[PDB]
Design a protein around this nucleic acid. Structure first.
Length: 519
DNA sequence: ACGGATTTGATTAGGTATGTGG
């Protein structure tokens, strides 16, 4: 029987059926579909979400990666479950937001990924691709020093352990925001609660949770003020979560905003003044199940969320589930039809970062000159070499020159914003076949961009007869290919191959002529 | 930028009902 091998992007011909293999400490570079390639809400179909994963043993050419050489292309077979496990929260309610969430996770985290060989059909051919079995977070952002330093002089505290004096004391409180009020004065009221009581705290104005029937006691409702010059920064941080400002939260005819379950890490200055506990919000950071937190912060955040959910009147939870989901990990459960609180939190704990820091420095414009969407011109290079499929796979670097290859067409696919063509060696019988080594025997070739697809179909409308699209299946064609590039993250690309002078028409008529010659 | 010596400093019921975009 077989012998050990090192897992590698090109090693799928060696993978055992139903064996699980492990990518340790992988960087997910990017994925497809994404905002650059599929603008609009292209519905993410199972098996058609693809991620690209680098491991740090693999070579680094540039910001253009090459699947099957220095990154894995990995099919996601159950998008719902992949999103749920990795920490994406908006699917299916919002494709756009889901992908944006996935971007934030992969840009900041490293993952242990379990993959396996999965059969897929190429017309009447079959081959193998990498599929994702599981994903476990391996490493996360380290605690920023600004957090470590600021909480050293603003220690974490429950409201009940705030001990005020004549002189200012500084603290960090994790709280539910309760009210926003402005009387046009010098400060803005953003009051908050812990459900934790303090004898110097006293604020009963609009002191309720969700509805008037669930009170917040006055010695739990911390009156707190923001200096006017600091409101706009807080406003813009919340706006990054709920796409609207602080004032706009108090929309129900009073100052209470608990129907939105907005949670902040408050950075506060406390001082007794004139008989009262005066609390000043010097900073506030929205805290979300996706916002990373230290373990110590979570000790306070977790019971906070538990009390909000348990004490919130049921009917308000029902009316505002989606709204509160911004901050509360609420889920819809099934046999019972009851919202439930999940335990879900992101925690704090170079090579690729510095490559895209270079690209952020220099032009995306240079690489964008090889975007697959850019109209494909004809005469870039003279005396193009004729080459095998294995040679093409090994080309690897953007030599920027045209290539010729003679290949059998296994299938052709209209994917809407691209045409995909699958090629194998010309010298095999029929198209019913199983390709055990896709790395050496299977080349996929694509056409992207309005101008290129218009030339391919002969129509600005992508109009075609379907039997003319697939007539070239089984024909052997002399292709000319150019390397082009597909954007998979803001500063990360993958390399692909695009055909030149290839039209539905030429492929169609060639196919008929070739049949007639053989017959 | 960066840090502290960090800007000021009020009421206590009860009505109505989202999500931030298909």
């Amino acid at each position: 029987g077989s012998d050990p091998f090192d897992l590698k992007p090109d090693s799928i011909s060696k993978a055992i059926t139903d064996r699980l293999y492990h990518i340790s400490d992988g960087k997910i570079l990017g994925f497809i579909p994404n905002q650059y390639l599929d603008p609009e809400s292209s519905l993410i179909e199972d098996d058609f979400l693809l991620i690209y994963v680098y491991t740090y043993e693999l070579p680094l050419l540039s910001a253009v990666f090459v699947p099957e050489y220095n990154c894995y292309e990995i099919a996601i077979t159950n998008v719902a479950k992949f999103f749920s496990k990795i920490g994406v929260r908006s699917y299916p309610h919002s494709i756009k937001n889901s992908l944006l969430e996935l971007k934030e996770l992969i840009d900041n985290n490293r993952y242990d990924i379990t993959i396996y060989k999965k059969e897929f059909t190429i017309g009447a051919a079959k081959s193998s691709k990498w599929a994702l079995k599981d994903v476990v977070l391996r490493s996360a952002l380290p605690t920023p020093k600004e957090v470590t330093f600021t909480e050293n002089k603003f220690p974490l505290v429950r409201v009940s352990n705030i001990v005020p004096s004549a002189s200012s004391r500084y603290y960090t409180v994790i709280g539910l925001a309760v009210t926003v009020k402005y009387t046009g004065g010098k400060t803005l009221v953003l009051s908050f609660t812990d459900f934790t009581a303090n004898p110097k705290v006293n604020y009963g104005y609009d002191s309720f949770l969700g509805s008037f029937q669930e009170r917040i006691p006055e010695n739990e409702h911390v009156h707190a003020l923001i200096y006017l010059n600091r409101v706009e920064s807080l406003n813009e941080k919340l706006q990054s979560i709920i796409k609207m400002g602080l004032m706009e939260c108090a929309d129900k005819g009073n100052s209470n905003i608990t129907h939105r379950s907005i949670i902040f890490k408050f950075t506060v200055k406390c001082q007794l003044f004139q008989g009262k506990l005066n609390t000043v919000i010097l900073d506030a950071d929205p805290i979300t199940p996706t916002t990373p937190v230290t373990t110590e912060e979570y000790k306070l955040l977790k019971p906070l969320r538990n009390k909000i959910f348990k004490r919130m009147p049921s009917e308000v939870i029902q009316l505002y589930t989606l709204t509160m989901s911004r901050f509360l990990p609420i889920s819809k459960n099934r046999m019972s039809e009851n919202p439930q609180l999940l335990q879900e939190q992101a925690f704090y704990d170079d090579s690729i970062a510095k490559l895209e820091n270079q690209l952020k420095r220099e032009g995306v414009d240079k690489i964008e000159e090889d975007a697959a969407t850019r109209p494909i011109e004809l005469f870039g290079t003279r005396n193009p070499k004729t080459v095998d499929i294995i040679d093409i796979k090994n080309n690897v670097q953007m030599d920027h020159k045209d290539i010729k290859v003679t290949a059998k067409i296994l299938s052709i696919f209209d994917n809407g914003n691209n045409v995909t063509i699958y090629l194998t060696r010309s010298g095999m019988v029929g198209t019913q076949c199983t390709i055990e080594n896709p790395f050496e025997e299977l080349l996929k070739v694509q056409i992207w961009g309005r101008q290129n697809l218009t030339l391919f179909f002969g129509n600005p409308n992508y109009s075609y007869k379907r039997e003319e699209l697939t007539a070239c299946i089984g024909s052997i064609v002399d292709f000319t290919l150019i390397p082009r590039v597909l954007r998979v993250n803001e500063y990360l690309y993958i390399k692909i191959w695009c055909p030149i002078y290839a039209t539905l028409e030429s492929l169609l008529i060639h196919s008929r002529l070739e049949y007639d010659n053989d017959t």
